[PDB]
Design a protein around this ligand. Structure first.
Ligand SMILES: O=C(CCCc1ccccc1)Nc1cnccc1C(=O)O
Ligand SMILES: O=C(CCCc1ccccc1)Nc1cnccc1C(=O)O
Ligand SMILES: [Fe+2]
Ligand SMILES: [Fe+2]
Ligand SMILES: [Zn+2]
Ligand SMILES: [Zn+2]
Lengths: 330, 330
């Protein structure tokens, strides 16, 4: 068994190795990368996502989300309050303002301490889930807008043609903007490229221990748990590394910097925060190894969790028994 | 299963919890601490090993050992060259001299980098394995000179009375002084208290993965491996964290500071280095759970490894089949 401690692995593909996405994901897994639930990939020195980021101020964030916290410092829920549209130029200026800017800090460790101590007392604004891409059309390797689709993977493995098209999303962040504990829709993989700006810190639980996190979550958020058997799908629940330690939940942490890829693996619970103004791009993907996770994925049928048009087909084909109840749920 | 990632756990016993050594070791293990191979224990704020360290300059280091390296930066062997006796006062002055002092550095991470890059190009002097204790006679808790003996544990578990008496050892360190990869004699536990001075960085492999380290060691030190089936017992072999990563060996690292205890668990391979002038005290101990490790411990019978008077009895009772060949070995 490779990577039995489930450590987060960091990869440095050569230009040649960076030419076949599926092959390299399979290679990473042959080294046990998936057992951590998250891997970092540093692209070849000669590679670039696009020429410059000089002309991105005019992107619209149609619905910025103010992330409002309830609970205690290390155990809280966050709800998203919709705000008026703003351009990325306006957003960046807001992120850099005295009210929202990254505070003085010694290092990543000091900033993490400040995040968990102080996060709940501020309400940062997140420009999340914006359909689009910042990869140059001519970028041929690891272009998140040119990956093979989940629908084609499911067709290749199961011999069934289905509707749907999955495309990338942009995320414009500032200090304290947060992603709550979750696995991907249908326990898919995700790939995240940090285009520019300040770092993003990640926490992850190994897939083999995901049910331990779920059990702790039910204990820590009893109301939410009664409401929905898969409430973590709502992406509202935060639990600090201190609280995870106290409860013996195995986990790992790593900081992603601009120019680096992170891949999350099937059923790898993850959460994190942004250090300051930044922009990331992400998309879900699948491999043959995902199919069995897709079949076993928990579903929110309470109506809260956002269902994409594409997920109908995944549930319909992989989870026919669950399909009706899930459908009437939302 | 507690601590399935085999993370090094840090404990903060209260004064009340610090009153029963065996009980607290058992508690730590009930939380899965042993799976890492190493745990840190921070004593209660009210506890002290002794009043001051003002009067320790007159301790004699009868045989200081100059640690001379051969091999490459990340894979080397060290031999111990005997030097003339010196007092701890003289040793401390040598450790603080321009030739031997800790170099300027940003943090522990920068110093670790410097250690592994530069260790082989210098020959620091180690005052190791000095029989004695710096615990005050009146220190009633976690006094390493007042622990129950291995001989009494073996008697309590196996009903056999044996000769021998195990006592503590002092270690006077300076920058770059090194302990090579090893498990304890008879795969016993050890406890190490850092009395004073600069830190000690530890690396450890989880006991469940010890044979992976051994296999890599045989590959990296082929000559030594041919010479002795348990050559790591010689305590001469160093392998850097970079090399361990490259070869997929699961391991963890932690830095011990003055006033802190480290416990190594049965068959937990460990290695490390001192940051600067310091003084540690250590002793081996046993629990009921050790007996089965004692029975399976590998032995050096090539004559190189130092056998204590006490180990005869352990091998004689726990490994009667191996006893003859081991005895003629040394
Ligand atoms: O889920 C999110 C943003 C939150 C989406 C959401 C949740 C609830 C309500 C509205 C929007 N973001 C990520 C997820 N997984 C990995 C990384 C991120 C990220 O923010 O870079
Ligand atoms: O083994 C040693 C010192 C080397 C003993 C030795 C080896 C070979 C030849 C002479 C002396 N030291 C430790 C072992 N295990 C944990 C910690 C230490 C330590 O130096 O604090
Ligand atoms: Fe995600
Ligand atoms: Fe040791
Ligand atoms: Zn729900
Ligand atoms: Zn030997």
């Amino acid at each position: 068994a490779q990577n039995p401690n489930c450590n987060i692995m960091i990869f440095h593909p050569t230009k040649e190795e960076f030419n076949d996405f599926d092959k390299y994901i399979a290679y990473m897994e042959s080294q046990g990368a998936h057992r951590a639930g998250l891997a970092k990939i540093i692209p070849p020195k000669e590679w670039k996502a696009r020429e410059t980021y000089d002309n991105i101020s005019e992107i619209l964030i149609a619905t910025p989300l103010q992330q409002v916290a309830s609970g205690r410092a290390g155990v809280f829920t966050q709800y998203h309050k919709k705000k008026k549209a703003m351009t990325v130029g306006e957003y960046r200026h807001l992120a850099n303002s005295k009210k929202y800017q990254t505070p003085p800090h010694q290092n990543f460790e000091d900033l993490e301490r400040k995040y968990w101590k102080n996060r709940i007392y501020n309400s940062p604004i997140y420009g999340a889930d914006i359909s689009g891409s910042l990869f140059d059309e001519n970028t041929k390797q690891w272009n998140l807008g040119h990956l093979g689709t989940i629908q084609d993977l499911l067709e290749k493995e199961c011999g069934v043609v289905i509707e749907g098209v999955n495309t990338p999303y942009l995320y414009f962040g500032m200090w304290k903007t947060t992603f709550a504990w979750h696995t991907e829709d249908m326990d898919l993989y995700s790939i995240n490229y940090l285009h520019l700006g300040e770092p993003k810190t990640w926490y992850v639980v190994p897939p083999e221990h995901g049910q331990r996190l779920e059990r702790l979550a039910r204990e820590l958020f009893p109301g939410s748990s009664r409401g929905c058997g898969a409430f973590l799908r709502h992406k509202v629940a935060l639990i600090s590394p201190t609280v995870l330690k106290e409860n013996g939940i195995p986990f790992n942490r790593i900081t992603q910097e601009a120019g680096e890829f992170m891949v999350t693996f099937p059923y790898g619970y993850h959460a994190g925060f942004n250090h300051g103004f930044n922009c990331a791009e992400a998309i879900n993907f699948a491999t043959p190894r995902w199919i069995d996770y897709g079949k076993m994925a928990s579903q929110c049928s309470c109506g809260e969790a956002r269902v994409t048009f594409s997920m109908d087909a995944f549930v319909r084909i992989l989870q026919p028994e669950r399909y009706d109840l899930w459908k009437r749920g939302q």
